[PDB]
Each structure stands twice: as C-alpha cells, then as structure tokens.
GROMACS .gro file of N, CA and C in nm:
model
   48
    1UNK      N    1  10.362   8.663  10.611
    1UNK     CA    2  10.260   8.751  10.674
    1UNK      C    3  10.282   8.894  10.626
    2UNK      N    4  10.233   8.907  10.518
    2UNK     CA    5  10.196   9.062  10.491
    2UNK      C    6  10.120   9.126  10.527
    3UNK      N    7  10.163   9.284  10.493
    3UNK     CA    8  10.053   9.391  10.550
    3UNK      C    9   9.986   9.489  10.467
    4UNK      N   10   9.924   9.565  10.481
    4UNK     CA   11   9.867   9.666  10.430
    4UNK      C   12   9.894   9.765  10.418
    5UNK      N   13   9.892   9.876  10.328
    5UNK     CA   14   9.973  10.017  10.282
    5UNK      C   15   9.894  10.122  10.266
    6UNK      N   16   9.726  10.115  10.316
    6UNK     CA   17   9.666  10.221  10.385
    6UNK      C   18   9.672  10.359  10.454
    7UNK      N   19   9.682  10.435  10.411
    7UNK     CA   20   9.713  10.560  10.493
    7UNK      C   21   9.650  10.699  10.535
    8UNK      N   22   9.602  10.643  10.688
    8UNK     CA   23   9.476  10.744  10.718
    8UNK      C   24   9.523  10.885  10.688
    9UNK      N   25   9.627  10.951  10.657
    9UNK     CA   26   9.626  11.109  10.576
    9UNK      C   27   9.590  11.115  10.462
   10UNK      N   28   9.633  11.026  10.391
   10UNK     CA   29   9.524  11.068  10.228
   10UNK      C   30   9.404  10.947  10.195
   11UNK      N   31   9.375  10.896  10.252
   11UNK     CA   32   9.231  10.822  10.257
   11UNK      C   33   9.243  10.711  10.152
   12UNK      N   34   9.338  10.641  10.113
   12UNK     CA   35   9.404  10.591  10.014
   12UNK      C   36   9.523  10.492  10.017
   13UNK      N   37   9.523  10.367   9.912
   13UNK     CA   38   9.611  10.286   9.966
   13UNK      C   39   9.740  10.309   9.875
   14UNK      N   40   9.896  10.268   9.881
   14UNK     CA   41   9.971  10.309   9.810
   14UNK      C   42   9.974  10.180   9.691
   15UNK      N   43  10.022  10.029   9.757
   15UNK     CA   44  10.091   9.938   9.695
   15UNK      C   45  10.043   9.824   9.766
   16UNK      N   46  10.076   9.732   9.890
   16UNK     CA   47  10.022   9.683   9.909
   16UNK      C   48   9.873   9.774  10.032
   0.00000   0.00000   0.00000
C-alpha cells in the first residue's frame, strides 16, 4: 500500500 508525494506548498508532486 503506497502513497502519494503531492505537496500542497509547491502545487507539485516530488517522486511518488
């Protein structure tokens, strides 16, 4: 169960 690497400060995902 993976997750997501989304990040609402720069509006942008890193990796996953």
């Amino acid at each position: 169960v993976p997750i997501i690497y989304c990040n609402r400060r720069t509006x942008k995902c890193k990796r996953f």
